[PDB]
Write a protein that binds this ligand. Structure first.
Ligand SMILES: [Zn+2]
Ligand SMILES: [Zn+2]
Ligand SMILES: [Zn+2]
Lengths: 36, 36, 36
């Protein structure tokens, strides 16, 4: 169905946004090690 | 077409899941450096 | 609408591709710390 698709996409957008944050968090910890 | 969309979404869900694992793998290596 | 969906998916595919690169970039910096 069409609606199931809309929900899969919506959950993917969330997953993606949570991944961008995780990456920013990781980069921050990596930068701490790399400079200090 | 509708079916092409369904396939693009399915491949995106896989890509996303592989990215969550990569991030978990990275965080693990980062935590090793950060504590030991 | 159908077209709005197509655009959301297209922007998600980009976001995902940019995340794979970020992860590769991070892993590269992490590997530098881990071996050198
Ligand atoms: Zn740096
Ligand atoms: Zn830690
Ligand atoms: Zn290594």
């Amino acid at each position: 169905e069409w609606e199931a698709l809309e929900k899969k996409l919506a959950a993917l957008e969330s997953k993606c946004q949570a991944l961008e944050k995780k990456c920013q968090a990781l980069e921050k910890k990596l930068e701490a090690l790399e400079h200090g």
